[PDB]
């Protein structure tokens, strides 16, 4: 596994990327809400790299972007002294794939975006707007209707609690178009039109022997399950026909279950991306 420094002109800094080669197409493994600046949470908490070693797929783990939602923000987060504007969608769709193509031979098209929690919706949004780059997208316990109802408030609370980040610096006031633009439920017609292969998982809040037995992990999983079930219904009602929906009667908002899903989807990704 290599630790790379990839310049981001749009953010004015270098972004650390953990990288395992192994094929021209890649799985982009996006982090959760509390992404650290040293290593991606997939590497800290799971054997993701080992599990995809010799899979015929490269594995890309960008590092950093706490509370970023892997999106382009309007402005720096005001409350916590951020001195630049997050531009993580520009980085993921323009800057990083160009760098990996030139230097590693990773194809900028035909890749998979895999997100969990915070980035579950991000992965679907990336596939909705960049279908040539991401014919495959997985959302593990994602928040799939962020513009609806109380979700902007809940997202604002969680972002302020995880590092003091300001959701209004990200997508503006709740009536700003950026909220619906980045709402996977709203963008289901794009996923259908693109025939995106989507893998949508959410547990029910009940731990198994995999662990993750704590109240916040149980609560968050049960909370977002309802949104995920609604997403499944709306996808089918809108003509969606290329989805895998995994809602087993177990699982909390914790890394063992996300790893179990990453392993489970490997053959699916291999078949879609490599044939």
């Amino acid at each position: 596994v290599e630790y790379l420094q990839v310049p981001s002109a749009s953010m004015g800094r270098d972004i650390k990327v953990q990288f395992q080669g192994g094929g021209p197409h890649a799985v982009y493994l996006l982090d959760g809400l509390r992404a650290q600046d040293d290593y991606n949470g997939w590497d800290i908490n799971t054997p993701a790299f080992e599990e995809y070693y010799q899979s015929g797929l490269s594995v890309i783990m960008p590092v950093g972007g706490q509370s970023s939602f892997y999106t382009d923000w309007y402005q720096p987060s005001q409350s916590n002294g951020q001195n630049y504007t997050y531009k993580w969608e520009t980085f993921l769709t323009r800057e990083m794939p160009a760098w990996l193509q030139a230097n590693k031979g990773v194809s900028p098209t035909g890749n998979a975006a895999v997100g969990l929690s915070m980035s579950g919706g991000s992965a679907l949004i990336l596939a909705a707007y960049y279908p040539q780059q991401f014919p495959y997208a997985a959302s593990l316990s994602g928040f799939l209707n962020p513009s609806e109802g109380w979700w902007p408030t809940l997202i604002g609370l969680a972002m302020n609690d995880s590092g003091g980040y300001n959701a209004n610096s990200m997508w503006g006031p709740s009536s700003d178009p950026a909220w619906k633009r980045n709402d996977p439920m709203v963008q289901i017609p794009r996923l259908v039109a693109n025939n995106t292969r989507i893998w949508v998982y959410c547990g029910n809040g009940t731990p198994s022997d995999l662990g993750g037995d704590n109240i916040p992990a149980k609560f968050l999983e049960g909370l977002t399950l309802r949104t995920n079930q609604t997403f499944r219904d709306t996808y089918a009602a809108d003509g969606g026909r290329n989805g895998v929906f995994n809602f087993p009667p177990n699982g909390t908002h914790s890394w063992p279950y996300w790893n179990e899903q990453l392993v489970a989807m490997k053959a699916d990704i291999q078949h879609v991306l490599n044939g």
Side-chain angles (χ1 to χ4, degrees):
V1 168
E2 304 187 355
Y3 303 155
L4 310 172
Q5 298 288 329
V6 179
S8 171
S10 60
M11 294 187 265
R13 63 204 57 248
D14 304 320
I15 305 300
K16 184 173 179 179
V17 181
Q18 302 180 258
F19 177 81
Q20 183 173 266
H25 300 114
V27 183
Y28 292 41
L29 288 177
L30 307 182
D31 212 335
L33 189 76
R34 292 191 55 73
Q36 300 181 185
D37 286 339
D38 47 3
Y39 307 92
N40 185 294
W42 284 101
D43 197 27
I44 294 169
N45 295 285
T46 79
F49 280 129
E50 184 274 341
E51 287 158 343
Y52 277 65
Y53 178 65
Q54 296 176 336
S55 64
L57 301 160
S58 293
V59 181
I60 302 166
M61 292 191 191
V63 180
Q66 182 180 11
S67 288
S68 68
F69 275 81
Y70 292 103
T71 198
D72 283 4
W73 288 44
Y74 281 134
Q75 56 185 306
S77 187
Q78 297 299 314
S79 29
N80 65 5
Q82 192 181 33
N83 53 33
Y84 69 103
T85 305
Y86 274 150
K87 297 296 186 186
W88 269 92
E89 180 173 309
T90 294
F91 179 73
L92 291 174
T93 62
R94 294 291 181 261
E95 299 166 342
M96 193 187 64
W99 195 99
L100 290 170
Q101 172 181 49
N103 298 296
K104 255 71 177 76
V106 177
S107 180
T109 56
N111 303 298
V114 174
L116 66 306
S117 195
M118 177 195 77
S119 62
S122 307
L124 297 173
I125 291 304
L126 286 168
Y129 292 102
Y130 304 89
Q132 298 312 291
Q133 183 172 10
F134 299 114
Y136 191 106
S139 172
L140 310 182
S141 312
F143 298 92
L144 297 190
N145 206 2
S147 69
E148 190 272 335
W150 293 7
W151 287 111
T153 300
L154 299 180
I155 288 169
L157 284 174
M159 290 173 61
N160 197 42
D161 303 336
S162 160
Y165 285 85
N166 188 338
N168 296 120
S169 302
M170 179 168 75
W171 294 332
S174 54
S175 52
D176 186 286
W179 284 87
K180 286 175 185 292
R181 189 272 186 184
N182 293 294
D183 185 316
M185 192 84 65
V186 178
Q187 301 314 322
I188 277 171
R190 291 179 193 271
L191 296 171
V192 174
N194 300 341
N195 197 37
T196 305
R197 217 308 201 266
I198 65 174
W199 178 293
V200 174
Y201 162 82
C202 193
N204 80 340
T206 296
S208 69
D209 57 0
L210 288 184
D213 183 11
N214 64 82
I215 287 187
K218 293 190 282 188
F219 181 85
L220 285 182
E221 200 74 356
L223 179 66
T224 198
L225 174 60
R226 313 173 63 96
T227 315
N228 275 258
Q229 290 166 332
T230 298
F231 182 96
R232 181 185 187 168
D233 298 343
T234 304
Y235 178 79
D238 287 355
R241 53 173 296 263
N242 205 15
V244 174
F245 293 91
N246 293 343
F247 301 137
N250 43 67
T252 73
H253 207 80
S254 57
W255 288 98
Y257 305 97
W258 298 326
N259 179 246
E260 186 282 326
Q261 286 293 297
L262 181 68
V263 172
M265 76 177 61
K266 176 166 74 177
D268 207 68
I269 298 177
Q270 289 172 314
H271 171 76
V272 173
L273 300 192
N274 293 331

PDB file of all heavy atoms in Angstrom, residues 229-257:
ATOM      1  N   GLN A 229     -35.223   2.660   3.385  1.00  0.00           N
ATOM      2  CA  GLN A 229     -36.367   1.928   2.851  1.00  0.00           C
ATOM      3  C   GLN A 229     -37.187   2.803   1.909  1.00  0.00           C
ATOM      4  O   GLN A 229     -37.641   2.334   0.860  1.00  0.00           O
ATOM      5  CB  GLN A 229     -37.224   1.408   4.003  1.00  0.00           C
ATOM      6  CG  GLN A 229     -36.538   0.285   4.761  1.00  0.00           C
ATOM      7  CD  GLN A 229     -37.189  -0.010   6.094  1.00  0.00           C
ATOM      8  OE1 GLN A 229     -37.794   0.866   6.715  1.00  0.00           O
ATOM      9  NE2 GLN A 229     -37.058  -1.249   6.548  1.00  0.00           N
ATOM     10  N   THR A 230     -37.397   4.073   2.269  1.00  0.00           N
ATOM     11  CA  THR A 230     -38.092   4.990   1.371  1.00  0.00           C
ATOM     12  C   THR A 230     -37.322   5.157   0.071  1.00  0.00           C
ATOM     13  O   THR A 230     -37.918   5.215  -1.010  1.00  0.00           O
ATOM     14  CB  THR A 230     -38.283   6.351   2.041  1.00  0.00           C
ATOM     15  OG1 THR A 230     -39.093   6.200   3.216  1.00  0.00           O
ATOM     16  CG2 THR A 230     -38.947   7.339   1.080  1.00  0.00           C
ATOM     17  N   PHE A 231     -35.993   5.239   0.160  1.00  0.00           N
ATOM     18  CA  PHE A 231     -35.178   5.366  -1.043  1.00  0.00           C
ATOM     19  C   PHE A 231     -35.379   4.162  -1.951  1.00  0.00           C
ATOM     20  O   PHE A 231     -35.556   4.306  -3.167  1.00  0.00           O
ATOM     21  CB  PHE A 231     -33.702   5.520  -0.661  1.00  0.00           C
ATOM     22  CG  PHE A 231     -32.788   5.718  -1.840  1.00  0.00           C
ATOM     23  CD1 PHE A 231     -32.403   6.994  -2.225  1.00  0.00           C
ATOM     24  CD2 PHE A 231     -32.318   4.631  -2.564  1.00  0.00           C
ATOM     25  CE1 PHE A 231     -31.558   7.184  -3.299  1.00  0.00           C
ATOM     26  CE2 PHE A 231     -31.486   4.814  -3.652  1.00  0.00           C
ATOM     27  CZ  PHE A 231     -31.099   6.092  -4.016  1.00  0.00           C
ATOM     28  N   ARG A 232     -35.355   2.962  -1.372  1.00  0.00           N
ATOM     29  CA  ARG A 232     -35.605   1.763  -2.162  1.00  0.00           C
ATOM     30  C   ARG A 232     -36.956   1.828  -2.865  1.00  0.00           C
ATOM     31  O   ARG A 232     -37.061   1.491  -4.052  1.00  0.00           O
ATOM     32  CB  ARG A 232     -35.527   0.520  -1.279  1.00  0.00           C
ATOM     33  CG  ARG A 232     -35.755  -0.758  -2.067  1.00  0.00           C
ATOM     34  CD  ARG A 232     -35.795  -1.979  -1.168  1.00  0.00           C
ATOM     35  NE  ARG A 232     -35.852  -3.209  -1.954  1.00  0.00           N
ATOM     36  CZ  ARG A 232     -35.669  -4.425  -1.455  1.00  0.00           C
ATOM     37  NH1 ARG A 232     -35.416  -4.584  -0.160  1.00  0.00           N
ATOM     38  NH2 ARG A 232     -35.732  -5.480  -2.250  1.00  0.00           N
ATOM     39  N   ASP A 233     -38.003   2.242  -2.149  1.00  0.00           N
ATOM     40  CA  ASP A 233     -39.336   2.315  -2.752  1.00  0.00           C
ATOM     41  C   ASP A 233     -39.390   3.345  -3.868  1.00  0.00           C
ATOM     42  O   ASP A 233     -40.004   3.109  -4.915  1.00  0.00           O
ATOM     43  CB  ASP A 233     -40.382   2.675  -1.699  1.00  0.00           C
ATOM     44  CG  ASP A 233     -40.487   1.646  -0.606  1.00  0.00           C
ATOM     45  OD1 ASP A 233     -40.001   0.513  -0.807  1.00  0.00           O
ATOM     46  OD2 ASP A 233     -41.054   1.978   0.456  1.00  0.00           O
ATOM     47  N   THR A 234     -38.789   4.513  -3.641  1.00  0.00           N
ATOM     48  CA  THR A 234     -38.815   5.576  -4.636  1.00  0.00           C
ATOM     49  C   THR A 234     -37.994   5.205  -5.868  1.00  0.00           C
ATOM     50  O   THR A 234     -38.379   5.528  -6.997  1.00  0.00           O
ATOM     51  CB  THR A 234     -38.308   6.868  -4.002  1.00  0.00           C
ATOM     52  OG1 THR A 234     -39.104   7.152  -2.839  1.00  0.00           O
ATOM     53  CG2 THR A 234     -38.396   8.035  -4.971  1.00  0.00           C
ATOM     54  N   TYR A 235     -36.859   4.531  -5.666  1.00  0.00           N
ATOM     55  CA  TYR A 235     -36.052   4.049  -6.788  1.00  0.00           C
ATOM     56  C   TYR A 235     -36.854   3.104  -7.673  1.00  0.00           C
ATOM     57  O   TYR A 235     -36.881   3.251  -8.901  1.00  0.00           O
ATOM     58  CB  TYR A 235     -34.801   3.361  -6.242  1.00  0.00           C
ATOM     59  CG  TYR A 235     -33.865   2.756  -7.266  1.00  0.00           C
ATOM     60  CD1 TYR A 235     -32.982   3.552  -7.983  1.00  0.00           C
ATOM     61  CD2 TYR A 235     -33.835   1.382  -7.479  1.00  0.00           C
ATOM     62  CE1 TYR A 235     -32.099   2.998  -8.897  1.00  0.00           C
ATOM     63  CE2 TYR A 235     -32.959   0.817  -8.390  1.00  0.00           C
ATOM     64  CZ  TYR A 235     -32.095   1.634  -9.096  1.00  0.00           C
ATOM     65  OH  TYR A 235     -31.217   1.087  -9.995  1.00  0.00           O
ATOM     66  N   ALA A 236     -37.522   2.123  -7.060  1.00  0.00           N
ATOM     67  CA  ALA A 236     -38.323   1.175  -7.827  1.00  0.00           C
ATOM     68  C   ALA A 236     -39.481   1.875  -8.526  1.00  0.00           C
ATOM     69  O   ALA A 236     -39.743   1.624  -9.709  1.00  0.00           O
ATOM     70  CB  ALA A 236     -38.829   0.061  -6.911  1.00  0.00           C
ATOM     71  N   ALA A 237     -40.160   2.783  -7.823  1.00  0.00           N
ATOM     72  CA  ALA A 237     -41.282   3.504  -8.417  1.00  0.00           C
ATOM     73  C   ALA A 237     -40.846   4.396  -9.578  1.00  0.00           C
ATOM     74  O   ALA A 237     -41.647   4.673 -10.478  1.00  0.00           O
ATOM     75  CB  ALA A 237     -41.987   4.337  -7.349  1.00  0.00           C
ATOM     76  N   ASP A 238     -39.600   4.867  -9.574  1.00  0.00           N
ATOM     77  CA  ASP A 238     -39.094   5.718 -10.643  1.00  0.00           C
ATOM     78  C   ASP A 238     -38.477   4.926 -11.794  1.00  0.00           C
ATOM     79  O   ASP A 238     -37.863   5.526 -12.680  1.00  0.00           O
ATOM     80  CB  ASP A 238     -38.064   6.715 -10.090  1.00  0.00           C
ATOM     81  CG  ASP A 238     -38.700   7.837  -9.267  1.00  0.00           C
ATOM     82  OD1 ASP A 238     -39.952   7.907  -9.184  1.00  0.00           O
ATOM     83  OD2 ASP A 238     -37.939   8.656  -8.700  1.00  0.00           O
ATOM     84  N   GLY A 239     -38.626   3.603 -11.804  1.00  0.00           N
ATOM     85  CA  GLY A 239     -38.119   2.781 -12.885  1.00  0.00           C
ATOM     86  C   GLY A 239     -36.745   2.200 -12.654  1.00  0.00           C
ATOM     87  O   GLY A 239     -36.173   1.616 -13.585  1.00  0.00           O
ATOM     88  N   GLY A 240     -36.198   2.342 -11.448  1.00  0.00           N
ATOM     89  CA  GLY A 240     -34.878   1.802 -11.160  1.00  0.00           C
ATOM     90  C   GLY A 240     -34.876   0.285 -11.226  1.00  0.00           C
ATOM     91  O   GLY A 240     -35.776  -0.386 -10.717  1.00  0.00           O
ATOM     92  N   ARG A 241     -33.853  -0.261 -11.885  1.00  0.00           N
ATOM     93  CA  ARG A 241     -33.795  -1.701 -12.105  1.00  0.00           C
ATOM     94  C   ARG A 241     -32.381  -2.254 -11.984  1.00  0.00           C
ATOM     95  O   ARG A 241     -32.120  -3.358 -12.473  1.00  0.00           O
ATOM     96  CB  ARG A 241     -34.372  -2.057 -13.484  1.00  0.00           C
ATOM     97  CG  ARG A 241     -33.750  -1.284 -14.644  1.00  0.00           C
ATOM     98  CD  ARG A 241     -34.239  -1.812 -15.991  1.00  0.00           C
ATOM     99  NE  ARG A 241     -33.815  -3.193 -16.212  1.00  0.00           N
ATOM    100  CZ  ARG A 241     -32.738  -3.549 -16.912  1.00  0.00           C
ATOM    101  NH1 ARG A 241     -31.970  -2.624 -17.482  1.00  0.00           N
ATOM    102  NH2 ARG A 241     -32.435  -4.833 -17.045  1.00  0.00           N
ATOM    103  N   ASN A 242     -31.455  -1.524 -11.367  1.00  0.00           N
ATOM    104  CA  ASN A 242     -30.075  -1.977 -11.299  1.00  0.00           C
ATOM    105  C   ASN A 242     -29.534  -1.812  -9.891  1.00  0.00           C
ATOM    106  O   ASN A 242     -28.390  -1.400  -9.688  1.00  0.00           O
ATOM    107  CB  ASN A 242     -29.206  -1.236 -12.315  1.00  0.00           C
ATOM    108  CG  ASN A 242     -27.971  -2.025 -12.716  1.00  0.00           C
ATOM    109  OD1 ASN A 242     -27.880  -3.233 -12.471  1.00  0.00           O
ATOM    110  ND2 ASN A 242     -27.017  -1.347 -13.344  1.00  0.00           N
ATOM    111  N   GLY A 243     -30.350  -2.145  -8.893  1.00  0.00           N
ATOM    112  CA  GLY A 243     -29.994  -1.929  -7.502  1.00  0.00           C
ATOM    113  C   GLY A 243     -29.957  -3.217  -6.701  1.00  0.00           C
ATOM    114  O   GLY A 243     -30.703  -4.160  -6.966  1.00  0.00           O
ATOM    115  N   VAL A 244     -29.063  -3.251  -5.722  1.00  0.00           N
ATOM    116  CA  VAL A 244     -29.021  -4.280  -4.690  1.00  0.00           C
ATOM    117  C   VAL A 244     -29.366  -3.584  -3.381  1.00  0.00           C
ATOM    118  O   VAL A 244     -28.695  -2.622  -3.003  1.00  0.00           O
ATOM    119  CB  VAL A 244     -27.630  -4.933  -4.597  1.00  0.00           C
ATOM    120  CG1 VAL A 244     -27.582  -5.894  -3.418  1.00  0.00           C
ATOM    121  CG2 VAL A 244     -27.265  -5.643  -5.907  1.00  0.00           C
ATOM    122  N   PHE A 245     -30.411  -4.045  -2.696  1.00  0.00           N
ATOM    123  CA  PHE A 245     -30.851  -3.415  -1.452  1.00  0.00           C
ATOM    124  C   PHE A 245     -30.752  -4.445  -0.337  1.00  0.00           C
ATOM    125  O   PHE A 245     -31.473  -5.450  -0.349  1.00  0.00           O
ATOM    126  CB  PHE A 245     -32.266  -2.862  -1.591  1.00  0.00           C
ATOM    127  CG  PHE A 245     -32.351  -1.714  -2.560  1.00  0.00           C
ATOM    128  CD1 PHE A 245     -32.619  -1.944  -3.905  1.00  0.00           C
ATOM    129  CD2 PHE A 245     -32.114  -0.408  -2.129  1.00  0.00           C
ATOM    130  CE1 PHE A 245     -32.669  -0.885  -4.814  1.00  0.00           C
ATOM    131  CE2 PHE A 245     -32.158   0.642  -3.017  1.00  0.00           C
ATOM    132  CZ  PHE A 245     -32.453   0.404  -4.371  1.00  0.00           C
ATOM    133  N   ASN A 246     -29.835  -4.205   0.604  1.00  0.00           N
ATOM    134  CA  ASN A 246     -29.537  -5.136   1.687  1.00  0.00           C
ATOM    135  C   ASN A 246     -29.998  -4.525   3.002  1.00  0.00           C
ATOM    136  O   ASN A 246     -29.347  -3.615   3.534  1.00  0.00           O
ATOM    137  CB  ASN A 246     -28.047  -5.445   1.744  1.00  0.00           C
ATOM    138  CG  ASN A 246     -27.569  -6.225   0.537  1.00  0.00           C
ATOM    139  OD1 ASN A 246     -28.367  -6.806  -0.200  1.00  0.00           O
ATOM    140  ND2 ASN A 246     -26.265  -6.245   0.340  1.00  0.00           N
ATOM    141  N   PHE A 247     -31.097  -5.044   3.537  1.00  0.00           N
ATOM    142  CA  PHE A 247     -31.654  -4.589   4.812  1.00  0.00           C
ATOM    143  C   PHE A 247     -31.840  -5.795   5.724  1.00  0.00           C
ATOM    144  O   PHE A 247     -32.970  -6.218   5.991  1.00  0.00           O
ATOM    145  CB  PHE A 247     -32.978  -3.850   4.605  1.00  0.00           C
ATOM    146  CG  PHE A 247     -32.874  -2.631   3.711  1.00  0.00           C
ATOM    147  CD1 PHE A 247     -33.847  -2.379   2.753  1.00  0.00           C
ATOM    148  CD2 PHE A 247     -31.814  -1.747   3.828  1.00  0.00           C
ATOM    149  CE1 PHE A 247     -33.765  -1.265   1.917  1.00  0.00           C
ATOM    150  CE2 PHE A 247     -31.719  -0.628   3.000  1.00  0.00           C
ATOM    151  CZ  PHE A 247     -32.703  -0.389   2.042  1.00  0.00           C
ATOM    152  N   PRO A 248     -30.749  -6.381   6.214  1.00  0.00           N
ATOM    153  CA  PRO A 248     -30.879  -7.564   7.075  1.00  0.00           C
ATOM    154  C   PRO A 248     -31.341  -7.155   8.461  1.00  0.00           C
ATOM    155  O   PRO A 248     -31.183  -5.986   8.849  1.00  0.00           O
ATOM    156  CB  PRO A 248     -29.455  -8.139   7.095  1.00  0.00           C
ATOM    157  CG  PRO A 248     -28.566  -6.937   6.880  1.00  0.00           C
ATOM    158  CD  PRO A 248     -29.338  -6.018   5.965  1.00  0.00           C
ATOM    159  N   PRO A 249     -31.894  -8.070   9.229  1.00  0.00           N
ATOM    160  CA  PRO A 249     -32.426  -7.742  10.560  1.00  0.00           C
ATOM    161  C   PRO A 249     -31.353  -7.652  11.645  1.00  0.00           C
ATOM    162  O   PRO A 249     -31.500  -8.204  12.736  1.00  0.00           O
ATOM    163  CB  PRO A 249     -33.399  -8.893  10.826  1.00  0.00           C
ATOM    164  CG  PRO A 249     -32.761 -10.051  10.119  1.00  0.00           C
ATOM    165  CD  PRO A 249     -32.191  -9.473   8.856  1.00  0.00           C
ATOM    166  N   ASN A 250     -30.273  -6.944  11.345  1.00  0.00           N
ATOM    167  CA  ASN A 250     -29.175  -6.754  12.281  1.00  0.00           C
ATOM    168  C   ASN A 250     -28.314  -5.627  11.744  1.00  0.00           C
ATOM    169  O   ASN A 250     -28.537  -5.125  10.639  1.00  0.00           O
ATOM    170  CB  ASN A 250     -28.356  -8.025  12.465  1.00  0.00           C
ATOM    171  CG  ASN A 250     -28.100  -8.720  11.155  1.00  0.00           C
ATOM    172  OD1 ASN A 250     -27.381  -8.206  10.309  1.00  0.00           O
ATOM    173  ND2 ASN A 250     -28.716  -9.881  10.969  1.00  0.00           N
ATOM    174  N   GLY A 251     -27.342  -5.225  12.544  1.00  0.00           N
ATOM    175  CA  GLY A 251     -26.344  -4.266  12.095  1.00  0.00           C
ATOM    176  C   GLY A 251     -26.515  -2.938  12.813  1.00  0.00           C
ATOM    177  O   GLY A 251     -27.634  -2.435  12.973  1.00  0.00           O
ATOM    178  N   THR A 252     -25.397  -2.370  13.265  1.00  0.00           N
ATOM    179  CA  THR A 252     -25.395  -1.037  13.844  1.00  0.00           C
ATOM    180  C   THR A 252     -24.538  -0.125  12.976  1.00  0.00           C
ATOM    181  O   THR A 252     -23.906  -0.562  12.011  1.00  0.00           O
ATOM    182  CB  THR A 252     -24.879  -1.055  15.286  1.00  0.00           C
ATOM    183  OG1 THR A 252     -23.461  -1.276  15.282  1.00  0.00           O
ATOM    184  CG2 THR A 252     -25.556  -2.149  16.086  1.00  0.00           C
ATOM    185  N   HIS A 253     -24.511   1.158  13.335  1.00  0.00           N
ATOM    186  CA  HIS A 253     -23.756   2.161  12.571  1.00  0.00           C
ATOM    187  C   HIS A 253     -22.275   2.081  12.954  1.00  0.00           C
ATOM    188  O   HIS A 253     -21.733   2.947  13.647  1.00  0.00           O
ATOM    189  CB  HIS A 253     -24.337   3.542  12.858  1.00  0.00           C
ATOM    190  CG  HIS A 253     -24.153   4.540  11.764  1.00  0.00           C
ATOM    191  ND1 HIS A 253     -24.952   4.571  10.643  1.00  0.00           N
ATOM    192  CD2 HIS A 253     -23.307   5.592  11.653  1.00  0.00           C
ATOM    193  CE1 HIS A 253     -24.593   5.583   9.875  1.00  0.00           C
ATOM    194  NE2 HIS A 253     -23.599   6.220  10.467  1.00  0.00           N
ATOM    195  N   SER A 254     -21.611   1.018  12.483  1.00  0.00           N
ATOM    196  CA  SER A 254     -20.254   0.730  12.936  1.00  0.00           C
ATOM    197  C   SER A 254     -19.484  -0.071  11.890  1.00  0.00           C
ATOM    198  O   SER A 254     -20.060  -0.743  11.033  1.00  0.00           O
ATOM    199  CB  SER A 254     -20.262  -0.021  14.272  1.00  0.00           C
ATOM    200  OG  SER A 254     -21.004  -1.210  14.138  1.00  0.00           O
ATOM    201  N   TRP A 255     -18.156   0.032  11.975  1.00  0.00           N
ATOM    202  CA  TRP A 255     -17.287  -0.466  10.914  1.00  0.00           C
ATOM    203  C   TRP A 255     -17.376  -1.969  10.633  1.00  0.00           C
ATOM    204  O   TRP A 255     -17.194  -2.344   9.463  1.00  0.00           O
ATOM    205  CB  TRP A 255     -15.842  -0.071  11.245  1.00  0.00           C
ATOM    206  CG  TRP A 255     -15.610   1.401  11.072  1.00  0.00           C
ATOM    207  CD1 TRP A 255     -15.621   2.362  12.051  1.00  0.00           C
ATOM    208  CD2 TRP A 255     -15.360   2.083   9.840  1.00  0.00           C
ATOM    209  NE1 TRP A 255     -15.384   3.599  11.498  1.00  0.00           N
ATOM    210  CE2 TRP A 255     -15.223   3.455  10.143  1.00  0.00           C
ATOM    211  CE3 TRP A 255     -15.247   1.669   8.506  1.00  0.00           C
ATOM    212  CZ2 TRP A 255     -14.956   4.416   9.165  1.00  0.00           C
ATOM    213  CZ3 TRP A 255     -14.981   2.634   7.528  1.00  0.00           C
ATOM    214  CH2 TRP A 255     -14.846   3.989   7.868  1.00  0.00           C
ATOM    215  N   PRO A 256     -17.615  -2.861  11.603  1.00  0.00           N
ATOM    216  CA  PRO A 256     -17.682  -4.292  11.247  1.00  0.00           C
ATOM    217  C   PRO A 256     -18.736  -4.613  10.195  1.00  0.00           C
ATOM    218  O   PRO A 256     -18.515  -5.483   9.332  1.00  0.00           O
ATOM    219  CB  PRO A 256     -17.991  -4.965  12.593  1.00  0.00           C
ATOM    220  CG  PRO A 256     -17.362  -4.049  13.615  1.00  0.00           C
ATOM    221  CD  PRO A 256     -17.609  -2.662  13.070  1.00  0.00           C
ATOM    222  N   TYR A 257     -19.883  -3.939  10.251  1.00  0.00           N
ATOM    223  CA  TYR A 257     -20.954  -4.202   9.297  1.00  0.00           C
ATOM    224  C   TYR A 257     -20.642  -3.584   7.944  1.00  0.00           C
ATOM    225  O   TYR A 257     -20.967  -4.164   6.902  1.00  0.00           O
ATOM    226  CB  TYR A 257     -22.283  -3.681   9.863  1.00  0.00           C
ATOM    227  CG  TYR A 257     -22.535  -4.285  11.212  1.00  0.00           C
ATOM    228  CD1 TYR A 257     -22.201  -3.602  12.369  1.00  0.00           C
ATOM    229  CD2 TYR A 257     -23.059  -5.562  11.329  1.00  0.00           C
ATOM    230  CE1 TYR A 257     -22.397  -4.171  13.607  1.00  0.00           C
ATOM    231  CE2 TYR A 257     -23.260  -6.140  12.561  1.00  0.00           C
ATOM    232  CZ  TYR A 257     -22.924  -5.441  13.695  1.00  0.00           C
ATOM    233  OH  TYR A 257     -23.109  -6.014  14.934  1.00  0.00           O
TER     234      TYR A 257
END
